[PDB]
């Protein structure tokens, strides 16, 4: 495979450690570059958080319209949505949207408490067959991204398989499935990452993550026109180029991936 070689060249220039997984649902195969190495999730976990929330909505243990109230004491850094709604609160559905489409940290923390904390999300993931991904801390502590730390990590391959299970398998209702898809499709944080290397006709839902030690991630479900989706997980950490160049690394991965498909 020349794809593996291109990603190794790209990884060299980034100065860090690059992980890539592609899962093609039309076939069932999957590609990996460091796909079984641990990487810090940063905000990419928030997709899995909204999935677990939706499961309890499926179970009748939670409601999409339930309004959660909170105060300024609950607000953590980078909370561009929740910081506007302390006076009126926000519904669980609104928090999910904020968490996914803006990486709102306070929304994630509030959703994490309504679920039962990091251990709860981690237990949900084991219940759906993901034995690798783990969430250990809250926002913003889970973004430390220390090079040898297993807390708050996934692997590209595990994240890809989890996305597959959640977005197209049988763990969520079809309604909860479509809702999670629509949130990812409306993400506002990823325009410089995977989206920027994809052909414009391709429909795309994604969740980004950003953290210390030059960490820049993006995970996605992508539908080529008339064709089964693929799942793509990209994690970059310990990188030594600036933010704009780390974004460019992710975009080029998206390009190197689609070219590999033609």
Residue numbers in the entry: 27 to 58, 60 to 238, 240 to 252, 254 to 291
Question: Would you copy out the relevant sentences from the publication that reported this structure?
Answer:
However, 3D-structure determination shows that the GNCA4 is actually more preorganized for transition-state binding than the GNCAMP scaffold. Clearly, the specific mutations present in the GNCA4 scaffold have led to the population of a conformation in the W229D variant with a cavity where the substrate can easily form a reactive conformation, and with better architecture for effective transition-state stabilization. The several GNCA sequences studied differ among themselves at 8–20 positions, which are, in essentially all cases, distal from the neighbourhood of the Kemp elimination active site.
A hydrophobic-to-ionizable amino acid replacement generates a buried (or partially buried) residue with the perturbed properties that are useful in catalysis and conformational flexibility assists the generation of a completely new active site by facilitating substrate and transition-state binding.
